[PDB]
Amino acid sequence: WLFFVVLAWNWNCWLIPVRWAFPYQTPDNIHLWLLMDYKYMAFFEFNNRLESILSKAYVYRVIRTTAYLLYSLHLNSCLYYWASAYEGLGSTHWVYDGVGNSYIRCYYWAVKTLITIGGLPDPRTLFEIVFQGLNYFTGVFAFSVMIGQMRDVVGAATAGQTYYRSCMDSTVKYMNFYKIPRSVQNRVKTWYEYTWHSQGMLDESELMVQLPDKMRLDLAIDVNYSIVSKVALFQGCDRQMIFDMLKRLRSVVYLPNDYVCKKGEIGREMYIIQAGQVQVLGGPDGKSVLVTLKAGSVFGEISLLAVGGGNRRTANVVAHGFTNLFILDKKDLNEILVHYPESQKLLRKKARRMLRNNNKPKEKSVLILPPRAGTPKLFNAAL
């Protein structure tokens, strides 16, 4: 409906002017009016739709505005013509004898007298000053709204980049407050560059809070179901518990030659890999690279069970470069298990069985699960 409606409205608003005052045009080609004489916001709504549905969000407003401008030009032309007709004389008494040039000289006269430039005309009678004033104002209005739209678009376009430099130069001046050696400058610079590129944002958490609830769960269940809901340690329990466990997770990114488990430290964390590759190293010497995990793997899981890494981590680890592995701490584990004490007893029983087999036996891979993973069965069954 919109296409034909706007065509018809442009036609009926534009053809009539020259067909009421300009002398030799209303009977000359009287076919369009004769055969087409047969609170609006739908046009605005569908322009809104087209901006949304099509890549362009500016051509529609541009064409509407320039159509308004040329419509105003034509309407001013017609109204001064009718002012002359009502008064009898005036309004380009010499149109230069022909429609083919009458049209062009008419809108040339309109664009000439657009604001106040005058030129040829001289004071003839009353109301001329007021006439020139009104035309002046309408021209100024159209021009001003054009600049307004332009600055609108420029500002709305170049939005986050200014903030990006604001962060960067603020922190560089700060860090420079105390004369710190260059290495960390280079490190922080490349960190910032890599983060900013290919990501756009800087901390996706702040989007999560603004966005509602009850769909964040759907996002998390569409993203991180697999790797977690397969590990035998947390296997086979209340499905409605793991959801909070998931909801509290946090990302991090490392760089080349990055210690993560420097041997001889405590540790309280279970890492997990999303897109990268890390090497289980065997010391600063010739790289005892036993294996390098690829993706969808887990590491250091036992340390979350009542003792964080046994006051000394398993083995040294370093990274090639950019890793992007998630992180999950222990406080979350204890809080989720106290909210849902259904499985706290079974995880706890596994923990005592592990500590009781940590001293007297070795138990490489023979008695790990069946006595540990056996305790989930009856324990939560006692809920």
């Binding site: 609108d152 989007l207 966005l211 009850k214 996002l219």
Partner: protein
């Protein structure tokens, strides 16, 4: 000493303000437009010498209603003179009061009847004129026509002043001694106050729109004049465009924010490949959020009000249905108030399984407008409609002895359209009950009564109470 006082915000104030505007606006034009010409002065002074005195006496009256307006002390607005006046006498804004009423209509004795330029004082009572429509904007229905109307007014008065000045300078060299200046006048068709003014106005407007369709200067006094005129026209243009730009930027700050958020969510979604069904669902939820204009959240909309107003609005909006629940009947409202103060909304999407199976269900859910149904494990016909005010989840919120394997309801419920219900919490009910140690017994007694009358397996074991 008990004088009556007007309210400093009542409609009387507004109407008197509209009264005191006409005279100063009249004096801001007619004095100079009478100094310029001389064929209205000494020609129409009959009505003029009358119209002047009414405005003088209205100025005098203006000096009055200022001293009888109060100013609150401590929720109390002082309501007597002899100190309603001391502050006004001691402040500023009284020097103008001294100056701008002095009758100097005697200097005409040394200046005849051809100098109505002696009245260069009535133009100091302008703060009131400003304030009138500086303030009336906040009372109107919709602004954003008022600013442009004001700018139009100011520019028009400017051009009138300049059309005055041009004639004033013209009649100092001789009518017709040049070609730039106004022509000679003793000839006919020229000099009857209908041509002596419109022509000047035309010339002034052309000159200040600065395009140059008039004969050029020749005498070297106006080489100053035209320069100054151009240097003022530029500033006029700058002011109008800057003002309209700020206006047009301000009245659109919602769409930009909404589009920025949709941008962020689109980028994040297409950063880790998710099923496209989620894209469809997410976008067909965002459009729903936008369409009924529900972008804001009830959490933060209300966060700035003082606490009390929040209390009254909350109690008004919802206590009826809480008192409509099938258990809370004989509850001291000194509890229901803090209970109501603890509600949090939930809003849902089509085809969401709320509980659907054996789970904990440790909350309280009451339905607003929306449709819910209870089904079996599979996608079959509904068994009951939770049409308009239905609710379950009540008995779960407590923990009574000898329950029927509590907090593991296995019913199957599901949303279809859009629901937007509300939620409560067990722990909060505990903490807000802590201070009324009498109802708890009644509540648990009623719960045991209903559970027993439900024909269920309450183990009904006697309590221990062995050690008090």
């Amino acid at each position: 000493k008990e004088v009556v006082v007007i309210d400093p915000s009542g409609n009387t104030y507004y109407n008197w303000l509209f009264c005191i505007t006409l005279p100063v606006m009249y004096n801001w034009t007619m004095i100079i437009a009478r100094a310029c010409f001389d064929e209205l002065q000494s020609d129409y002074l009959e009505y003029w010498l009358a119209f002047d005195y009414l405005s003088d006496v209205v100025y005098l009256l203006d000096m009055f209603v200022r001293t009888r307006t109060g100013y609150l002390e401590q929720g109390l607005l002082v309501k007597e003179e002899r100190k309603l006046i001391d502050k006004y006498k001691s402040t500023f804004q009284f020097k103008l009061d001294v100056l701008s009423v002095i009758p100097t209509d005697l200097l005409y004795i040394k200046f005849g009847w051809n100098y109505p330029e002696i009245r260069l004082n009535r133009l100091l009572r302008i703060s009131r004129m400003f304030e009138f429509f500086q303030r009336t904007e906040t009372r109107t229905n919709y602004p954003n026509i008022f600013r442009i109307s004001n700018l139009v007014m100011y520019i028009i008065i400017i051009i009138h002043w300049n059309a005055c000045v041009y004639f004033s300078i013209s009649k100092a060299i001789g009518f017709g001694n040049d070609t730039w200046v106004y022509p000679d006048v003793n000839d006919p068709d020229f000099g009857r106050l209908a041509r002596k003014y419109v022509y000047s106005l035309y010339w002034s407007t052309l000159t200040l729109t600065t395009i140059g369709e008039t004969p050029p200067p020749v005498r070297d006094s106006e080489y100053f004049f035209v320069v100054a005129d151009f240097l003022i026209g530029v500033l006029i243009f700058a002011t109008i465009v800057g003002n309209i730009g700020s206006m047009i930027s301000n009245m659109n700050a919602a769409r930009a924010e909404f589009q920025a958020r949709i941008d962020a969510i689109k980028q994040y979604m297409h950063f880790r490949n998710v099923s496209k069904d989620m894209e469809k669902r997410v976008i067909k939820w965002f459009d729903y959020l936008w369409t009924n204009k529900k972008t804001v959240d009830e959490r933060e909309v209300l966060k700035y009000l003082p606490d009390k107003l929040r209390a009254e609005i909350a109690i008004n909006v919802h206590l009826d249905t809480l008192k409509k629940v099938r258990i809370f009947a004989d509850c001291e409202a000194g509890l229901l108030v803090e209970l109501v103060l603890k509600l949090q909304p939930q809003v849902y999407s089509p085809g969401d399984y709320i509980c659907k199976k054996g789970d904990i269900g440790r909350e309280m859910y009451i339905i607003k407008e929306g449709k819910l149904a209870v089904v079996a494990d599979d996608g079959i016909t509904q068994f009951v409609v939770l049409s308009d005010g239905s609710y379950f989840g009540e008995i779960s919120i407590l923990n009574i002895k000898g329950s029927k394997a509590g907090n593991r309801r296995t019913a199957n419920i599901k949303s279809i359209g859009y629901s937007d219900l509300f939620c409560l919490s067990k722990d909060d009910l505990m903490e807000a009950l802590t201070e009324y140690p009498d109802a708890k017994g009644m509540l648990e007694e009623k719960g045991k009564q209903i559970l027993m009358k439900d024909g269920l397996l309450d183990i009904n074991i006697a309590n221990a109470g062995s050690d008090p």
